[PDB]
Design a protein around this ligand. Sequence first.
Ligand SMILES: Nc1nc2c(ncn2[C@@H]2O[C@H](COP(=O)(O)OP(=O)(O)OP(=O)(O)O)[C@@H](O)[C@H]2O)c(=O)[nH]1
Ligand SMILES: Nc1nc2c(ncn2[C@@H]2O[C@H](COP(=O)(O)OP(=O)(O)O)[C@@H](O)[C@H]2O)c(=O)[nH]1
Ligand SMILES: COc1cc(C(=O)c2c(C)oc3c(O)c(OC)ccc23)cc(OC)c1OC
Ligand SMILES: [Ca+2]
Ligand SMILES: [Mg+2]
Ligand SMILES: [Mg+2]
Lengths: 54, 438, 429, 317
Amino acid sequence: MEVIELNKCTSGQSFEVILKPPSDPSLEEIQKKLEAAEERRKYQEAELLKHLAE
Amino acid sequence: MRECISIHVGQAGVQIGNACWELYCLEHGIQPDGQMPSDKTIGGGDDSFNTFFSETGAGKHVPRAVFVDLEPTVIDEVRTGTYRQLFHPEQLITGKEDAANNYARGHYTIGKEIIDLVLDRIRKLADQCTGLQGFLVFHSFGGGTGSGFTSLLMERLSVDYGKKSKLEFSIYPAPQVSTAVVEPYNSILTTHTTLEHSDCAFMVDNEAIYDICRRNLDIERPTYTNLNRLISQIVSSITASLRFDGALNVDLTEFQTNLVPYPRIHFPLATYAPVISAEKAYHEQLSVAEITNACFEPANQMVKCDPRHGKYMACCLLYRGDVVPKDVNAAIATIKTKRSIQFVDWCPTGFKVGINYQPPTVVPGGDLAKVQRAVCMLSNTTAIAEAWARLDHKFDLMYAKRAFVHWYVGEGMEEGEFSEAREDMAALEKDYEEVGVD
Amino acid sequence: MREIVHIQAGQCGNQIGAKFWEVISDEHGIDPTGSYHGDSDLQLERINVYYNEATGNKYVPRAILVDLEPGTMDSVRSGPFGQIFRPDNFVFGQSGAGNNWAKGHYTEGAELVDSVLDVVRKESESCDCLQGFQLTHSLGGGTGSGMGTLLISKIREEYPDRIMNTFSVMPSPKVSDTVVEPYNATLSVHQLVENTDETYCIDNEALYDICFRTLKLTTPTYGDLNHLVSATMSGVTTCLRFPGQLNADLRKLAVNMVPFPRLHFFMPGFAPLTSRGSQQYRALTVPELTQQMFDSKNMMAACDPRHGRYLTVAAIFRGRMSMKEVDEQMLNVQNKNSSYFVEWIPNNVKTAVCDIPPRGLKMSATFIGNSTAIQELFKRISEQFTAMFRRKAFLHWYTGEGMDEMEFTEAESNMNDLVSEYQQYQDAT
Amino acid sequence: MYTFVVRDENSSVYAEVSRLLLATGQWKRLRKDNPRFNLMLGERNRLPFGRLGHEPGLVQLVNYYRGADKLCRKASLVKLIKTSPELSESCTWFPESYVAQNGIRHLIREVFLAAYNRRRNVWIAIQKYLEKPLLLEPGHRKFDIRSWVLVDHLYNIYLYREGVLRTSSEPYNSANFQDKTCHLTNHCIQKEYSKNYGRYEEGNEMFFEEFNQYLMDALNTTLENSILLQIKHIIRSCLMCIEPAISTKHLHYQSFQLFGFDFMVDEELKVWLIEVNGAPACAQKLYAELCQGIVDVAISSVFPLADTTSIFIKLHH
Ligand SMILES: Nc1nc2c(ncn2[C@@H]2O[C@H](COP(=O)(O)OP(=O)(O)OP(=O)(O)O)[C@@H](O)[C@H]2O)c(=O)[nH]1
Ligand SMILES: Nc1nc2c(ncn2[C@@H]2O[C@H](COP(=O)(O)OP(=O)(O)O)[C@@H](O)[C@H]2O)c(=O)[nH]1
Ligand SMILES: COc1cc(C(=O)c2c(C)oc3c(O)c(OC)ccc23)cc(OC)c1OC
Ligand SMILES: [Ca+2]
Ligand SMILES: [Mg+2]
Ligand SMILES: [Mg+2]
């Protein structure tokens, strides 16, 4: 068990103690997914209005 | 000096953001009007507190922060509350109608309409930075906005700010003090979409905070105010290395280096020092050994789980108060003899210690007592996967009947996004078993 | 203050609606003149939900009163709070509907419907952020049944993204005006299944039995029935009218209570059951409120919850009370009776507390259950339906208005379809 | 009213504990996947400990200790004894072990050969390292001792005062290792291969009264002093060793568990530890008494009944 990398300053200290050793989509793609959902939404809205039409 | 922008999304993120920035102002001696008499360099500077505060010519220190909610009530309380003058009005962004506890509505129908404006107000802050580090994003797993909009914001931040770090402070849903039945859905959806865009995420299980307030603060029914003041104490400990002079976790990238050896396993467990009631008429001050040993008690963790049945990949001890290295090492030697602390073998069994001499700060008229020394332990342990198992089970119980799924499909989501999200969670749980179980 | 637009239709609709406005106006401190003379800011902080802030510092209900005959609506104007309403919002025909769903939906009601939409649209124009609509009506009559559902259909067309909420009084031969009530109810349920987000099933059978078996009222009037309805409508709207920790609204109610779009018919229940005359002075303990509110004798739909299981539950407590006790008592009931709650919806009981009690009580609790046991009500209606439809009895009343037998067969089978969906989840594990 | 669920339909002892709890009128059994229980009689494999202790308003207890598998699996028990300093390389009561019948060489690893190569005998892979087993000369037969141990939520170690002796039926021969019967006293191999199962005692199970009486008549000693003292030590040692790893003292859920310890008594009255079984069956005569002890000690202690000695021996610390 040994202390390593001891740094001191007026605010405090920090060190490391080692006990034992070891053994994205595009803006084009984000826009596509967001608009594919608006079309899926506007379609279901159109199904409702055409159904209310009958 | 490399600046950090905080983003607070949804109710939980906004109200936790308030409690954090209130704490930050007290720790740095900044008044509610934004002035800081201790700051003798006026109009600017590259001090460590400037990581979180820019300075105006009038001597005013304003948070590098953006508050966004799809609904005005909560952020309206910011614009009128104690810290009106602290924030530029353009940093407090509200919609007109919230996501109705629905990820799909927060991410698609309502969020798509406000994403462009938020990004621009976010960019207005980035253009004030000489060397932007990255973002700290506060949100709930369960809320429609905190889950749906956050994931939408995380994607666009990755394209616009490709080289900047992004850390999360995430509220994990607890039935004890939750809001919605569909919070398991929102949690799984937002976690799946955000996983590949977040560099480090500190999860806070509302059940842990709630019981810590019940047990250690003797508060019968903790309020959000009670919870948020405690969370900010933990958050302040984690971010203190960014706002004060120190050698450990000085920049956001070092959080990843020290805490996250694998990018997907980026959920460190936080355990906090002593939580003592201000109302307690006589208290005995806990030694360095007593508070360091307390870091390995599940009763003090932000997420209830058993680290004895997992493996550590990293451990950080963040001290605040009267603490010297001699006492820390003596306490670690004592603890290792009596506790089940086992690391993955491709990692050295060792603790990274940071000490700030200033004892923790407490809000006047709060619930926490003033303490002479404290510590926040950040350990990356596979034991936190218990939380994923807990959540994924509740998801499975509802999805087997496709219960409530029509509310999401009705806003444009496909049923396949649900199963696509759950499969990523199943893969996340398998990764944790690979690293942690023999 | 996401605003709600209120609509009452028909004799039942307006008489129950009038009592609702009486109760909440007293709660919010609004006298019949329209001005506020109360003591607390909490009464006004969310007044915009149900009231427009009219010129001259007065509050006007955002309510539209609709009927195909002038009788019941003239008596509302004569009533204690009839002044409170806006006169342009009275929309009436003169020929009546003769307890005929066809007259309300296809003929007589069709002359008058656009006149009503013009008023609904005027009220929605001045709304900053409309939640949606709440309608009060019966299903056994002609106007509120036939035209109320036709209104619902037309409002969904013009406001497809707003919430549609109804208080629907179900007919019972124990409080029967007419034999054709099962026809009118079955046709209207078909409408409510399609075009409603949330319906409170107020069963006149349950209302009668509570007055008879519990309040010891030997001969109960529609007045005694409407006293129970008014107290329930005040209870279920508590979270909309008063500041809470939830910031509840109609959409979040539907999101959390309705796991399957068609299964949106709620069983309501109320605090201690109280008669208009009896002012009893012992306040209830929180265990009593909880025990009573889950009791079948306190349900407003004649169904036994022990014959089904709860998909979702919403409970609202009113008065000054330890919310630790409330939490302990509610967890007690779920843990003690977990067999009557579905296990595949975790945390399916939500409770909210409001510190201001209703008038005349210091403790109160309102119950909103989405139980598969509501299928008992629907198949009771359809049994009465089929008993006379297999003989095509009294159909001429409807075929003389243009309807076909085919439309009856379709409404019948869709309501039988409704019953099968409640059944599949009561046995699902 | 209390609440419990069953998730191991093949457990003989918890099927009995189920019958008793229901027969108190104060316990009700829910369907297995109902999360609103007080008591979980869980699976023996992949029990979800991570889902226990998160139900508001419920104290949750389970009949298994998470991590007790490190004592109840053959491979991990060897690595546990050799690695725990509390037990050591030099553990006088565990047969020398490095990592199915017995013989000499040829398997069926470096360090194994050297110890076997330090000989100027018999091995197994009821163990047969001890070619000097200790004879029951009213037949000249071998046995094994099974003591059932209950550890409650407070980590008291309760040793049931009734133990069983599963015996071999025919004489022991020092050169009959392919003949597995005369010196492998597993009960299932004793009902199939054996020659006269049931002559000397019923079901090849001699209880402690008859056995202690035999020790007095035949060797002028007692079961308490010559054997049980050593047994009490081995049980106390193993369970105290792993207590920091498995104790639920400061947890959001509680654990108890009933273990079965298999012992081997050599000819010089020295006790050897064979195996620890985490899901053990029980002798038929003793079922009613022991399962009543589980309820009084492990279940009713956490969930008390209404107001209206001991079958265990507490092993202290
Ligand atoms: N710790 C903490 N948790 C909170 C707070 N506010 C809400 N939550 C949790 O957040 C979840 C609900 O999400 P919210 O943040 O309230 O919802 P939202 O982000 O505003 O999104 P909307 O659905 O559109 O309102 C629940 O699990 C709550 O327990 C808070 O102030 N502190
Ligand atoms: N609870 C209650 N039910 C009523 C009231 N008035 C009528 N009903 C019921 O409603 C049905 C008659 O409908 P009604 O409202 O008179 O028809 P409409 O005027 O054509 O819309 C019957 O089942 C009555 O029992 C009332 O004031 N209260
Ligand atoms: C409109 O009237 C109400 C709305 C809400 C609500 O908006 C819910 C919110 C915000 O979360 C929930 C929830 O989680 C539920 O679970 C069953 C049920 C309802 C909700 C809750 C209510 O009572 C508890 C109401 O009745 C007065
Ligand atoms: Ca400066
Ligand atoms: Mg919100
Ligand atoms: Mg009538």
